[PDB]
Amino acid sequence: QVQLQESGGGSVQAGGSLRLSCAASEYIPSANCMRWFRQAPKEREWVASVLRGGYTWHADSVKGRFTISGDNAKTAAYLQMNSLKPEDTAIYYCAYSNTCPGASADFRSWGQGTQVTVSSH
Amino acid sequence: QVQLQESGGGSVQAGGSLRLSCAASEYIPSANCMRWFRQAPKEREWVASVLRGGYTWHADSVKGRFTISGDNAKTAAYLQMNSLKPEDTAIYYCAYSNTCPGASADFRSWGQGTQVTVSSH
Amino acid sequence: GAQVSSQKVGAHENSNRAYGGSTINYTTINYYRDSASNAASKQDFSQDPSKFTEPIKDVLIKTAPMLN
Amino acid sequence: GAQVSSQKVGAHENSNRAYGGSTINYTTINYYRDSASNAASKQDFSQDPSKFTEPIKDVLIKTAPMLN
Amino acid sequence: ACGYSDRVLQLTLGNSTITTQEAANSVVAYGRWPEYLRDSEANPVDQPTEPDVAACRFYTLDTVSWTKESRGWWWKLPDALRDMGLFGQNMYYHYLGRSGYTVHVQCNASKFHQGALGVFAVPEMCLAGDSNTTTMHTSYQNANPGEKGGTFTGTFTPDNNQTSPARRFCPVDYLLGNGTLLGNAFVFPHQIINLRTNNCATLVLPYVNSLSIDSMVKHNNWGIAILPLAPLNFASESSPEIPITLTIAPMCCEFNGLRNITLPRLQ
Amino acid sequence: ACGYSDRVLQLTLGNSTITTQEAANSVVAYGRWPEYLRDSEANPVDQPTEPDVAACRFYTLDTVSWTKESRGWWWKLPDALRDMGLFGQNMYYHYLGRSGYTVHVQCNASKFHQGALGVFAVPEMCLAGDSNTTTMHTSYQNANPGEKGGTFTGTFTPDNNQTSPARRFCPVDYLLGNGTLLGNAFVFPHQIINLRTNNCATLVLPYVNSLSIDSMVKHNNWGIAILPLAPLNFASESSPEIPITLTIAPMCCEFNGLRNITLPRLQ
Amino acid sequence: AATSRDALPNTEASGPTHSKEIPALTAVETGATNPLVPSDTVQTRHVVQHRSRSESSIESFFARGACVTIMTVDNPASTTNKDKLFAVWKITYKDTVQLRRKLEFFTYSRFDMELTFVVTANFTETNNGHALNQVYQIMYVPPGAPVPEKWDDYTWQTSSNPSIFYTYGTAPARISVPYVGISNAYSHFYDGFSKVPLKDQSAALGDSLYGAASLNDFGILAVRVVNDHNPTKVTSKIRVYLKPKHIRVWCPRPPRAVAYYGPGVDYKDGTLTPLSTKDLTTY
Amino acid sequence: AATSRDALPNTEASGPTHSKEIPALTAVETGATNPLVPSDTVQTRHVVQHRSRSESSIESFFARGACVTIMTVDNPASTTNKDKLFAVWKITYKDTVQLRRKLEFFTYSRFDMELTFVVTANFTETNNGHALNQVYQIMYVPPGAPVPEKWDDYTWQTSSNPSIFYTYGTAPARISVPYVGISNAYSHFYDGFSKVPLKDQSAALGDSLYGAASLNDFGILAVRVVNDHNPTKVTSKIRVYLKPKHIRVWCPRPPRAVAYYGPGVDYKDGTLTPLSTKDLTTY
């Protein structure tokens, strides 16, 4: 079926940087709004949402530090994680939408995710 | 953040007078309706509400004795407490609003308050 | 400023002292200042398809040989 | 007491026996006694910007030297 | 033919005359010359007082000094002329007053100096205050400096003394002192005194207000703002100085509602 | 009346405009304004190409520097403009071409500098070579320097390398570079840029040649020679410098005989 | 005779030039803007101009309605102690920024005002209770009249104050108001005071706020839920939209460049940098 | 003078023939279509023709409105963490297939556009809670204006953007828009790029998407539920319908034959076989 693949995760110390990438197996002629999500305990959390270009929304925790871009041609998105905090440690995911600038944990499928471990000191 | 500071509280005997004052740390370009509240057991009570000037409302207990003014320039309010009763003993507070002549215990923040102790005889 | 136009009557009621016959008209009054707000008049024109059907430089006479 | 005015037609329908061509008008009837209730006519005037652009006492002739 | 020029002008009002050899024409704000109040537009019913030549004449305010560090200056009308001869008197004795003006800003230098001053006449020139704790709090005294006027500044400094606030304006230059970008001020009637070109600015201003006549003691119709578009420079000197002088003449001024004299608290 | 002057001019061609506040009128060489080729004078039969605004516009060549030791400079037309936009292109694509010109030489200083430049437009400005062993031997490359032009000299220095001759011009100033006395150059259309008076020279030149139209790549119709009649001097300085800039606009240019592009050997 | 929707002037063909006429040169000192057109500096062709300024006329510029305030209500547990369930808002446009900025390009204006009210409501605590459609009373209390003290006092009788009874779920309410200013035009800015402090008086007595006058005192709008108390709490919001119609404006001004701060022209520290970074020689 | 509703030409009676006139023979190489009528190849009778092409005029062909997008909303548990409850959709017809294909028979067009909005809502989790009738705000944000960040920020004040406040349960909302293209006609196809890559520049800097231009950048529609948060979640959908009125079209083209794939003319593998099987000699 439709497949999204997360990549770029790893383990870094606090204050560090990362860049997560999510590409679709084949192109999707419907999904234009991409989103990022995370989780640690037993509850999912919305990171950022990005439509075609260049309207980009963020959350009250990841704003200013995180930035989403993504190609306006290839159905893929990118997450630049700066000034990383030990609280950011979680499994990050990717999910396509339709025309949904808003965000809610209500996606049909779920890829696999990518682990981000933030070291303290 | 936004800060309100109560002052002027103390301990007086019945029939006495006081004057409570509440000023904002810095000016607020939205909050024009100020209110006073009190409490003793485990329940808050609305004292008086004052918009810019000079519409002033009171409660069925503090009316005629209490009077609220406040500058129409500086975001601050004042409470003149006359003919004080031992029942008035409580912690008084201050809270800014918007365009809310009415009163309800539903304010976001909460400063600190000021204690008013009324002696009997 | 009413616009009265005629309708092309398809099915005719058994009437010629009100409906069916004596030309049935309809009224239209525009209510807005902007032309974009108007309804479609549908009173449109047709044209000869030649610009697409016969785009040749030298005129085509059907009875004659195309190539001469 | 109807006010009939013309519309400035932008996009024209393929019509000249109803729409597009033969000047499209629109009707307006005021229903209230108070002028404040009226809709905006939008039929407004323009003026020469001179009062702001050339507020000088001695007239400006573009081809000549400003300072003489 | 006879050699008449846009550069050489002579202005005569009452018993005063101003000459100039380096003018850049003159501006009649909004193309409206000052005029008396028409019957069709009249308001107060009593016969108005029209001082004419007694008040309609050129008064020279105190001279200021332009240096490399000058940020700008400002004045209010009729405020600046509040103490000027019969104009001042007629102003204080009446409840109502209206007046137009001929403002002439003067500043000469040499073929070796450089700099440019923007002279702007702003209708209803409300200036920003100095507090971040209270709005619209500048006091009457500070709002009306009279002939000395006030000055613009390059940095906003909030008044932090909440015990005894200064209650004054803190007009930031690039913000024209009212929260708008200076570069736009050119929408107001104005002239520029560019040293290489001219040595004076002349602005004829009509009475502008939402009413036919109003209280002069309470409200200033116009505001004169002078800011250095291009800074002062001379030869290779580090501290050049040239004076700037204002001369203002009320025009077609009329007053209504005579009473006893208003004695304002100015300090 | 309105203040129109011989000193203040504005020239507009194509999408370009030149203004000047210190002109000394302008010269229309031999009283003939540039024009297109008349039918009665025509030669090649094919329909000519007339670029109009694409080529008839002001092009600014590289700026040179005038010092106390400058002897003079020279350029050839249409050579100098050989690489200028569409004019250059139209020139190379056609076997034949004709064009008039508006040459505007620019050079400003101060009321404290002094000097005078003679700007001369010479029809068929053939310059003398550098050899005393061979005549008419200057090579195509050296004869056509393009926009950079060449320079005059104060002393004739014969080329003695007979192995590999330099094959260049050696134009002596007082000899106008062609064996005639400079003092006579004034017979050619000209203007003088005398610092105290003006800061520019304007020469409108018609197409001048023994034929109606000719090969532009082979033959230069006009030559621009700029020599310092009076040397540069400033204050009490030993090494003053002021730039000189040329801006040339082809006029009424037409071309015949289109083919593939000529790719000349320029070095 | 030139109407807003008329086509702008055509571009006239112009050829080369070489003369004493100097359109390009000017002197901004005079305070005049040089009235040039393309043909003054370049060669131009003939162009039949079709564009018009119809959308930029003052009337068309302020043709959109805009939010001004968000008035709210509230029901408690029972009465418990409270019965002051009603909103009173002092009518002033200076509460938002959007409409306010647009009304600042000019110094004075005159206009008939159209007000539209969009009312929305909702539940608070999850409950099986159901409220019946509400009716709201929007009462204009002009400066002077008695302002409501209790939610159910005499003032609500409205024998002279205009009032709009809005039923929930119907088309938003709307009314028109004539130019109601006490002056010949409304004053967007007022450089002065309401009181002249006199020397033979106390400073307190002669004091007033800079830039404030009754020129703009229009009174208040008092809104309440007509229906009696319900067991289940419903909160309601009334959004007010103002559209200045039949408008005229005087004296242009530079638009507000830094964030608004109060009903005056004042500015707050830290909001004084409207421009971003850009090199002088970078496109 | 020939109107769309006029009757087509009558069939003229024609008898036998034996001549040099050769209507039947032609040569398609010329690129012309042979303009024959029955009477040119067979004997015909006289027939008074009544049929008309009234239903096939361009205007009548696009007389039906068509869906373009499905915008949705969503409420969570409480806030928990979320307050981004609002839908923003980039206005483009190229999202569906039905209207898109119809608008491809031609290369260019001009038309006034009528938009109708059908709004529906529903409950999610079975509950005894009841929501009060909702009001929606459909805001057109033209290219440039600030796009809403929070559900309750300044942008929603709408001092210049046209907005429609729709009350639930009333007749679907509708508005008209003039031909708003920056060109003389809208371009259904654009064979080119927005940027010319220059040699003295980086490939990245000169890069752009094939077939994309601002010719079709119309901005966005932002929709939100005006009512405040309710304890019980309600989900809403706004369907947008476009009807091109007063339309004109240029340059006919072959209709799309394989499934659409993106906003371009591109095709996907495995969708390239529009024709079925049928023998050459089978009826």
Neighbours of G58 (CB within 10 A): 17
CA distances from F167 to F1, F140, F161, F267 (A): 58, 9, 10, 12
Sketch out chain G's domains with CATH numbers: 1-283 (2.60.120.20)
Number of folded domains in chain B?
A: 1
* E3 touches D at CB < 8 Å: no
Please answer whether residues B9 and B118 qualify as being in contact, where contact means their C-beta atoms are separated by less than 8 angstroms: no
As to burial, measured by CB atoms within 10 angstroms (0-12 exposed, 13-18 middle, 19+ buried), residue B27 is buried
- DSSP letter (8 states) at residue H59: H
The answer to whether the CB atoms of D10 and H178 lie below 8 A apart is yes
Neighbour subunits, H (≥3 Cβ pairs < 8 A)? A, C, D, G
Q: Which residues in C lie closer than 8 A to residue D17 (C-beta atoms)?
A: 43, 45
Q: Smallest Cβ distance to G123: which of H132, H157, H162? A: H132
Looking at residue D17, which CATH number applies to its domain? Answer: 4.10.80.10
- DSSP letter (8 states) at residue H10: P
Neighbour subunits, E (≥3 Cβ pairs < 8 A)? B, D, G
Spatial distance between the Cα atoms of F12 and F57, rounded to a whole number of angstroms: 8
Residue G272 tokens read as 């004084």
Nearest Cα neighbor of H159 from A70, G255, C60 is: G255
Neighbours of F95 (CB within 10 A): 17
Q: Which residues in H lie closer than 8 A to residue C52 (C-beta atoms)?
A: 252
The answer to whether the CB atoms of D67 and E29 lie below 8 A apart is no
In chain D, positions 20-39, which contact chain C (CB-CB < 8 Å)? 20, 24-27
User: Which of H72, H96, H234, H236 is most worth mutating to test chain A (most A CB atoms within 10 A of its CB)?
Assistant: H72
The answer to whether the CB atoms of H3 and D17 lie below 8 A apart is yes
Spatial distance between the Cα atoms of B64 and B77, rounded to a whole number of angstroms: 18
Task: Name the closest residue on chain E to residue G185, using Cα atoms.
Answer: E210
- The yes-or-no reply on E/B contact (3 CB pairs or more, < 8 Å) is yes
Residue A24 tokens read as 């679709």
What's the gap between Cα F47 and its chain centre? Answer: 29
Q: Which residues in E lie closer than 8 A to residue G206 (C-beta atoms)?
A: 140, 265
The answer to whether the CB atoms of D58 and E25 lie below 8 A apart is yes
How many angstroms away from the CA of D13 is the closest CA of chain E? Answer: 44
CA distances from B101 to B54, G58, G88, G255, H179 (A): 12, 37, 6, 33, 48
Sketch out chain F's domains with CATH numbers: 1-267 (2.60.120.20)
Residue H24 tokens read as 């039947």
* E24 touches D at CB < 8 Å: yes
Nearest Cα neighbor of E194 from E243, E143, E228 is: E228
Spatial distance between the Cα atoms of E3 and H251, rounded to a whole number of angstroms: 68
Please give the residue range of the domain that contains residue D30: 1-68
Q: Smallest Cβ distance to F15: which of G18, G19, G42? A: G42
Residues of chain G contacting H, Cβ within 8 Å:
64-67, 96-99, 101-102, 118-131, 168-172, 234-235, 237, 239
Neighbours of H64 (CB within 10 A): 12
Q: Smallest Cβ distance to D7: which of C2, C33, C42? A: C33
Helix, strand, coil percentages in chain B from 3-state DSSP, rounded to 5: 0, 45, 55
- DSSP letter (8 states) at residue F210: S
Q: In sequence order, which residues have a C-beta less than 8 Å from that of residue H26 and are 6 or more positions away?
A: C66, H32, H34
Please answer whether residues G190 and E219 qualify as being in contact, where contact means their C-beta atoms are separated by less than 8 angstroms: yes
* D64 touches F at CB < 8 Å: yes
Spatial distance between the Cα atoms of H178 and H163, rounded to a whole number of angstroms: 16
E74 strand-pairing partners: E150, E225
The DSSP bridge pattern shows strands B90-96 and B114-119 to be antiparallel
Spatial distance between the Cα atoms of E133 and B75, rounded to a whole number of angstroms: 7
Task: Name the closest residue on chain G to residue F9, using Cα atoms.
Answer: G20
Q: Which residues in B lie closer than 8 A to residue E137 (C-beta atoms)?
A: 73-74
Number of folded domains in chain C?
A: 1
Q: Which residues in G lie closer than 8 A to residue B29 (C-beta atoms)?
A: 260-262, 268
Q: Smallest Cβ distance to H112: which of D11, D14, D17? A: D11
Sign of CA pseudo-dihedral G180, G184, G186, G191 = negative
Q: What is the dihedral of CA F34, F39, F44, F45, to 10 degrees?
A: 140
Sign of CA pseudo-dihedral B50, B53, B57, B63 = positive
CA distances from F257 to A33, F52, F79, F90, F254 (A): 61, 17, 19, 11, 11
Q: In sequence order, which residues have a C-beta less than 8 Å from that of residue G270 and are 6 or more positions away?
A: none
The answer to whether the CB atoms of D10 and C35 lie below 8 A apart is yes
* G197 touches E at CB < 8 Å: yes
- The yes-or-no reply on G/B contact (3 CB pairs or more, < 8 Å) is yes
R_g (Cα) of chain A, nearest Å = 14
Spatial distance between the Cα atoms of A72 and A53, rounded to a whole number of angstroms: 6
Q: What is the dihedral of CA C6, C12, C13, C16, to 10 degrees?
A: 60
Looking at residue A41, which CATH number applies to its domain? Answer: 2.60.40.10
The answer to whether the CB atoms of E175 and G267 lie below 8 A apart is yes
Q: Which amino acid is at C22?
A: S
Please answer whether residues C15 and C21 qualify as being in contact, where contact means their C-beta atoms are separated by less than 8 angstroms: yes
Spatial distance between the Cα atoms of H160 and G64, rounded to a whole number of angstroms: 5
Q: Which residues in D lie closer than 8 A to residue F5 (C-beta atoms)?
A: 65
What's the gap between Cα C61 and its chain centre? Answer: 28
Q: Which residues in H lie closer than 8 A to residue A40 (C-beta atoms)?
A: none
How many angstroms away from the CA of D21 is the closest CA of chain H? Answer: 12
Q: What is the dihedral of CA H93, H97, H98, H99, to 10 degrees?
A: 20
The DSSP bridge pattern shows strands E27-28 and E200-205 to be parallel
Q: Smallest Cβ distance to G81: which of B45, B49, B98? A: B45
In what helix (H) or strand (E) does residue H88 lie, and over which residues does it extend? strand H87-90
Spatial distance between the Cα atoms of F234 and F112, rounded to a whole number of angstroms: 6
Q: Smallest Cβ distance to C30: which of D16, D25, D42? A: D25
Experimental method: cryo-EM
Q: Which residues of A29-56 are buried (b: 16+ CB within 10 A; e: fewer)?
A: bebbbbbbbbeeeeebbbbbbbbbeebb
Q: What is the resolution of this structure in A?
A: 3.8
The answer to whether the CB atoms of D11 and H178 lie below 8 A apart is yes
As to burial, measured by CB atoms within 10 angstroms (0-12 exposed, 13-18 middle, 19+ buried), residue H75 is buried
Please give the residue range of the domain that contains residue B72: 1-121
Q: Which amino acid is at H214?
A: S
How many angstroms away from the CA of F111 is the closest CA of chain D? Answer: 21
Neighbour subunits, B (≥3 Cβ pairs < 8 A)? E, G
In chain G, positions 214-243, which contact chain B (CB-CB < 8 Å)? 220
How many angstroms away from the CA of C7 is the closest CA of chain D? Answer: 12
For every residue of D15-61, DSSP letters joined together read: -SSSSSSS--EEEE----SSGGGSPP----B---THHHH--BSS---
Residue F186 tokens read as 């004034």
Q: Which residues of A80-97 are buried (b: 16+ CB within 10 A; e: fewer)?
A: ebeebeeebbbbbbbbbb
Q: CA triplet H35, H36, H39: central angle to 5 degrees?
A: 150
Q: Where do the H-state alpha helices sit in F18-175?
A: 85-93, 140-143
Q: Which residues of D6-21 are buried (b: 16+ CB within 10 A; e: fewer)?
A: ebebebbbbbbebbbe
In what helix (H) or strand (E) does residue F122 lie, and over which residues does it extend? strand F113-123
How many angstroms away from the CA of G78 is the closest CA of chain E? Answer: 39
